[model samples]
Target: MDEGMWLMQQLGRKYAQMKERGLKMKEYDLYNPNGTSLKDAVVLFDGGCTGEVVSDRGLVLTNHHCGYDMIQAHSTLEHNYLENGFWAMREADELPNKDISVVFIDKIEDVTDYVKKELKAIKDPNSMDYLSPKYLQKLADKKAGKNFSAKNPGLSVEIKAFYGGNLYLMFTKKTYTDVRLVGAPPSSIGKFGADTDNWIWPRHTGDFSIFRIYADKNGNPAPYSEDNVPLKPKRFFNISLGGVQENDYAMIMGFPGTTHRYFTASEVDEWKSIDNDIRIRMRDIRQGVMLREMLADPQIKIMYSAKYAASQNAYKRAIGANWAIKTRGLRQNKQAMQDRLIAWGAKQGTPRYEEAVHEIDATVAKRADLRRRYWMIEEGIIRGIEFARSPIPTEDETKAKEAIDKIRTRYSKFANKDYSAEVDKKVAVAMLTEYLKEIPYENLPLHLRLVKDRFAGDVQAYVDDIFARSVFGSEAQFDAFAAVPSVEKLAEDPMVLFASSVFDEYRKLYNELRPYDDPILRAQRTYIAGLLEMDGDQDQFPDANLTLRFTYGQVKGYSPRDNVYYGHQTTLDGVMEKEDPDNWEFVVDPKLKAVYERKDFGRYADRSGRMPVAFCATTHTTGGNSGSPVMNANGELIGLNFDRNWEGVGGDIQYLADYQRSIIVDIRYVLLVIDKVGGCQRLLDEMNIVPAHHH
Candidate 1:
């Protein structure tokens, strides 16, 4: 939207620049409200990733991890698709995914000038002084009401401020709800190298998966229907089998989750010293139990796969960001740049630019203090797994009865599902003890504090007591508790009692920090606006905020350490090199091994005849880019964007060409897994694959 999130409105303005950067398309070829282009192909992959229509038939491609939750939901021991992988032998066999959807952007309308005038028309003097979320919410409310509804049916609209409320844009989207799982490789392939090699360089994970969006016969979004047909899109990008060569042009279009490059060195320090430290420490204990349980049995593995991935994802990302901060000296770099910014603002000598430095610095100091307290409280609450089991019990019997009945319906609603109670109980005890030990004695929930008298400082005894007595200890017991709805009964629930005690502290502390939260929004937006003014007419990228954006760069990799060059691509051999058949994370399926052994990569192989698995590129990407389509200069799809190199995890907060990289999985490998290992010709035939065109 950036620290490189460029709005569609700015695309035409930057057309000359993108051409210089190797664009083959015209100004409106990729971004135009009145016309169709490759933009038709890109869509929001679920709530947290990007996806693209790869064929006119509406086949979508995204990261395996992005589809993990849906895949897990459809899996069972009888037909454990996650372990064996799922490939629909025919169209009828495709697994329909409920509540999974992709939103395609029809257009982005710039309404900044109009919104500004409307906000002024409100006749509020103080409104002009504030641009925080607190202020922007009202501005959006006053201005955007009913405007989107006037134009379209079956379309959704979101109006949000840009450049910290300096401007506004409305995104109109078409959402297809009847999404289905077409194919996916087993963990050995789709998740090769697993957590051990997650963010590292020279990655060889075949991190791609397949899904399809369905619509009515008329090719418009519709709910799941046996009568529904695959969406016939207006256009879809052709796959470029010509593998990328060094320094070749690459572009990525997707919704990047978020970035904070506007943050000051002070903020970066708060992240490194306090926030990341707490998260990494807490995640280690939580993920450790989950991972151990998962490996203990295939049953546990299937039950906890998605849950573990969700939890471990941020844990690894935090570790990576911490590594980048120290290794890249990010604080020093940000400080120097900010210092230059302050001097530049001083030279401007204008009201809009003057005093910006002092105003922001003071706010930064206050922001840091709030951040320290925020993390301590948030980390404990977020890491406390008990809430999912039994939320802080309610004193009011009415709402409690309603919620208890709600759980009863889910019990009736569930077809069937289970994980490991043995492992879950172990994790419960471990997390409970960790929370008490880590959170200060004063911060302990009142109920836990009562344990001093009840259990005499014995957390394990208290944990044992709850596990033995509470309905929350196991799913069956939870169903039993819900079967008979009673607030009085639930109030005495040992797990509920424990939860209420803890959440009481959390709710109290959360309220205490309310004042400290809004200032960050105000200072950040103000600082960014001023910094842009300091740049004068210089071209700048907006901060990513789940907006549609276009960014491109060279297909290249960097040397993480002196004399240690990481290449632009990784080969299939790298997967075998790291394989440990005995371990679940690194297991090498015999089918995959046989393919490698026979050197049967065929068309999927690069010119060197080695199968290209994953590659690191200088193309800018971040969190929400998981399923972004990596297009060639000719605008042909080349790979699915999944991750970032660990060394440049700091790119989310700062973009440095030297350290940043977008890790991508080659499209050819995606096809290879489909055609050869997966033996699914039906899925492969949907795509239009052009011949290799290495630059």
Candidate 2:
């Protein structure tokens, strides 16, 4: 076996043992059976849609936005951490915002049996029925409503299920209402390279922030406490001075949200043919316009940075997915494998086995529809602001109308107006360009064929017409046009009218293909399960659905393309190399500049004279993995796993270990920002963090 494959196996085995022992993954337990315990370290914090954890007492390790609300809450024109910078030395100087705090998950215990029993009697076959308000209500009554412990008074409690509902956990924690920004570099530093480099590789951005958690005198959850000292973390990993090298085994232990590796060949093909292409085109157009506009107007830089970043992330993933689908040849390979398996079953003369092969093929067909619906409805239609504003409401009319009205009103303001025209123009242009340039004539779908034909006449004219005569125009115009009230509401403007018409058709298609959404689909999936059981391939692993997954890999570099072997390590020199003078992402303080120019390579500096800034890890990760510490076997923080490489976009379908790398800015770089760069040494002192040499 190759060295990479062999190393993956060894590390996988090691992690398997760790999971078997139930070592609580990587962080402390905030929830115990007895109730929440403040004595334990706060492991996880809720950021509305995301979560983070306190890895150190004063050092809060989270996504740039896990503390977003806190940033927004505490931010003022004078102290805009999002723009300028914020730092506090003494406790008295720390800025606190009301109604903003970090929640701790103190403890968690498996309550799957309890949850399953409660769900068992329900006769409804629809999974949604069992998982909706009723399920949550029952859980709340059994856990949160009942005061089970005096130690954690008024502590919030919740039950989470992992591994396809095979296990559950009752999580409890104390929330403190006094989290303050310790230090954050300006957008140039905190959000360097902005969205253009969001999910791409060969990255050089200081995507780190520092925050402090405060507590009451009792050291329990309370409001802002002036007398409160910095929290002392129950467990904090020591920063590794030595960086990872090729063949070094490393792992990331954190919650990875979800994956779709179980998808069938047909489903994978659908993504390559339809879903990914659409996403790539849409995002490319949006980002292209936003970037141009932002570059033109410096004032809109901060305001549009988030939107551009989000679009960049989506665009990068789309490109990655497109590349993977083409390169992996997943559909062709799966079909060949399936044919071989079917032949083998026939030769054995086992009717059950032969039947299984047929079932597998049928399952693939059925799942294709499910996958398409999921992409179009869940991702494209329902989540889209334009679709949400449409006159017709599907499945849930009241909810849809409410959602649509809110979207319309929200967009009527300048925030949406500023980019809407450019977004539409870019999208229309991309659709035309892709049709004419990328897609082969034979592969052209009928509707796209028409768009392509119209596109050839006059590209600019087509874009202008589409924007002016469509919903891409001003929101006020569209609202007034839509309110004109008739069957014509569906055809008010080409964009809105076109979107509404397409949405209706898409909804109809989803409804017609609804039966595939049944639990019977899960039963059909057993064919794949059996195939995997028999194959016993070490390379293929299931997706991370809050399950205990052990992906093993050595620290290795790769040639992302011809003549380009990405080194395992990135240096601080690259950070300065990529800095744009006119449109810099990070505003390097004069002090930081002096340090760089004077060769003030502190303890964190490597032999390269540049600090070991970032590296890639092989651990599979996704959205829920924010703040996960990528560590060696000694449990020292090697790097922080922040995002997946653009080449790994198809990882959801099949893990392409060759290019499916996890991106992490080195822990040393983080320290440099906190200490030498930002001069937040006092903040580090609060966390009781000494240099690695001390240890």
Candidate 3:
């Protein structure tokens, strides 16, 4: 009925509406407060993404991109997981990942009153304690009791602000840290279209991966160890062989990261210009440098592949958002909403709404320059160069030795297979040169600013000098520094000064930017309050804050442009049709092509006797929804939610119900890849799949 990332607590109100769309499952079967339900199977995967438990043995299903870092970490020239794919044939073959964890939201409670009571104690009216994650987390833990975590191993609590702090929800979470990779299709299969087809429809990418959670003997969370065993999950999704049809009821549950549904015209303007525009510009330059180097050397290709993809992913998102803003008139739409709000506020005798709108506009205008500079520094320097985040020891002599030990540990990563100083240096030169064009010399890091006089404005010479002089540039230099550590020498190191100076100015700028925030934040809260009074909660759903949410729609398709209708589904035939060995992104693996030639799709084929690859649905989803489970009316897993078309990218700010659609990889494609391509029948046997005839 509406575009919403509805909270579990609010599902009751929508159940009747869902039923009208052919939802056969009972409400509690989807989410039950007093007992375990399907909600228990959906988890906050690897912090930012979502995963669904698919078996009693805790087999978690997610997007290949969600597990890209882990896959890349294990990849090497001798054993390239990204190229060939990895499948754990036996339980012993599963690869453990470092620090990869999933959070099971055991319970969520309304904590508005509790959080508000604590908010009154704050004396600073300008304080953002109302929406502060750290402050609310403390309140959540306090409500859960001080010793709650100690008593329940791996359990934690967090509170999230919603609707501009109009609501608060405390979530009791259980974290499983021992997550391991079970299977992943090669990039050719998983990331088939890559950047060329990232946020587009009629996608043929089999964008799914398999992982499992491990626990201690007694079924408790534990660190990776041989003694640990596969976790016995309370619930897991039942796979559906009843493939989706047109108008089939489809629902998605995941952690949709962030949305600005409450943003005013000023916020929209700021987001398009300072945030997306600068990011798109800066990443284009950085990605170009990385691509040139990656194309030249195989080693650099392997090492920088993940980093390059990471940069491109966000780069694409920024470009899409800007494209939507320009082509879709998103700013004008928000302006209309604000205009109506202003007119409505006059009749309501609430002049604060108009005043708040003015304050928001004034603050946005005042901070435009600073925000632009911040984005330039962040995207260009901080995120552009690897060494920008290199560790620096503290000034205290007593702790400096111990700090060096930790710094040595950190710097040891420089020797990791992924790190290449040559690439870093090349990237630095290009990025710094481009950065200098937009940012003045005076605004640079104090140590870097001196380069104007020292190197005669030569960014290349300045970067080269730092690499040649700094210990951080090489393993040998770091070893020598570690042999005889000194605070003065450490502080004098050009790299250290470079890092410190950059961060010092960044912090100063941050502090300078803080005052402008209070007015905008305070006004935003009132603006949202006025919206709530005018519209009411019937149509209002809180913006996504990386919290578990449910969004239901249907398996449908639409035309993106006049005379250009797109189908609801894509098949392996489309994948074969798109194949081009000349282009890496479109290149089909020989084995995959062989399977296609033989028509060995098995039961994974749709009733039309074709192998389904992916499908599109009118579901509301965003970035972090990657790897979310897309289920049919019967609450059976049908597809894996992965990406959205570029036209739908604006849904993050405003839902384009007609244009927006969630691009999902068909579950049949996932099964076909695992069973036919990877020969991982053990996984298929492990899952509880409902056969097609039964459906």
Candidate 4:
């Protein structure tokens, strides 16, 4: 076997052990009487933010981007909270973000019986097999609503499920929406390298922000007001002073997005060869264009910052995925395992066993097209603006529609603007170009070919019209178009022609494979349950419904390429070393330069005299693990788990405990930029931190 294959075998052994031990779900209970609980510590807000209820007073800790919308809602030139950073030097200085809130899943109870009964009632219904899962869920939720209303009366409660219908929950929680910006670093510190360094390793981007949740006098959810004070939470975590070390048993408690570990070998191979390549190429092209455009006009830096950051993240993931495929030999290993299982089953002489093996092999055989179908559904059909215009009456349709309308209203103000249209056009073109480029020419089905031809013609016209009619020229027109139609309708539009072209293909494939969804989900549940059964019944497995999950690791490092060991530290000097010098992404702040020149290493300095960029530890994690906390065992913030080492990407399928490292930014460095570098002290205080020395 090659070195990569050998390494994977070793990793597979470790994963087998983990599975036997049932060390999956890693949730912990925090019985805080008047602060954010351990449960609260795990619950997170989407868009990359963290929150905590320190003491009875409400204090939240999270990355800056998490609070960007809130900050934007309340910020003005006179009070540029995001640009200048905010610290309530006094209570009056804490500016409120209109209607901002932090919600917690306070309690969770299983309602599996209720869900299973509903599913049983609707088995094999003719109308829409695919829609059955959603419809069943809605019915169960309605039943649950009445039960929860009687039990909790006026509290906000929600239901979350995973692994299909095997598990269900009723989560009751308190939400504090009157959140205010407490403090943040300047764009220089907060954004730092911006999108250029998002997912890269040895990185030095200070991705942190500060906010506080406010409550009414009775400590209930309420709107922001001058009279409102910081909320007194019922549970919160205690900050720790110490940092993590190699091999320490650390756990991250947060929502994690999704995983493809259960995918067939074909799926894995397809992603490695096709999907990863397409994503990387597309992101690289767009980022190149965006960087050049932003560099020409320094003032447009803020405007492009978020967009660039997102693209950069995709770029990094693509790189990671590429590396993972090579290092893990996922395709070969999966096939080998399937062969072994098949051989074993054949020896048993079970009829169903042979059929099962054949099914698995058939799925793997059609891997490429199936994967294309999956991606088309996700990116082209489901998220397409045209489809979003035609609202689906799911359980949350009303709320979802309200949210959509609100965004539409917001976009109307920018409708006539040139810059807005420019951004839209560029993004649309980028998406279309990506779709065209990725669909292998040799493999184009007849329908796909026709769709592609139609799209090519329509896209050119759309681009021309937007540029000619838009205020910002053609570039801004797509943005205006995107905003006008409901995303559903836009998704259906020929402008987003790929959506219509792929929808039927996807649906047909889904129907053909519909019977397997349940069995597949069942197998996953069984696998997890089996692990739990073997592991002495530990209830600490991390939740994994493809949301964001936090996994803590120490600053300690390791060696992968041989002859070079990565330390648990990095410095600003390293940033300059990697920077392009002339690029805005590589631009350094004058103040930071002064600090470096003077050798002023404030409290942020690790043992290496550098701001640790990315540190690694043996924390179990997966893709949606982005923007998660890497806290110490005592629950003090240490770093933010942003990416996994290339070697660790296949950890989900087979964890190599020795190399399954999670990457994160040191929390100290983030704070240093805010407190000493950016001079945002008020933001520091809002964390209600006792400081590392105190502990």
RMSD of each: 3.2, 7.3, 1.8, 7.9
Candidate 3 segments whose C-alpha is farther than 4 A from its true place: 121-126, 397-404, 484-489
Residue-wise lDDT of candidate 3 within 448-565, one digit each (tens)?
A: 7765778988877888888788878788888888898766666778887788777887778788888888888889889998888988887788888899999989888879888999
Better of 3 and 4 by lDDT: 3
Q: What's the lDDT for candidate 1?
A: 0.77
Q: Write the per-residue lDDT of candidate 4 for residues 150-191, one digit (tens) a residue.
A: 565335655555533345555566666677776666655556
TM-score of each: 0.92, 0.71, 0.97, 0.73
Candidates 3 and 4: which is better by TM-score? 3
What is the overall TM-score of model 1 with all chains considered together? 0.92
Which portions of model 1 miss their true places by more than 4 Å?
Answer: 1-3, 124-151, 350-373, 387-404, 410-421, 475-488, 693-695
lDDT of each: 0.77, 0.56, 0.88, 0.53
Best by TM-score: 3
Q: What does the lDDT read for residue 30 in candidate 4?
A: 25
**Residue-level error in angstroms, candidate 4, position 46:** 3.2
How many clashes in each structure? 7, 11, 0, 61
Let me know the TM-score candidate 3 reaches against the reference structure.
0.97
lDDT by residue (tens digit), candidate 2, 1-695: 11111211133344444444322343222112343322233234443322233344546665554444455445554555666666777667777766665655555556767777777766545465333445654685576665654545537766654323344566665667777766665555556676567676777766666666777655566567677776665555556676666667676655555665655566566666667776765456546655777677554554555555655666677777777778878677666666665566566564443465455456556666445544544333333333234333233423324555654554454234224455435545544454445444544333334454766656566546645665436666656644653334433445555455445555666676665554434433444544554565454444554422234455666678888888777776776777666655534556556767887867777645577777876666666565556666555566666776777666666666677777777777777777776677765554433355432
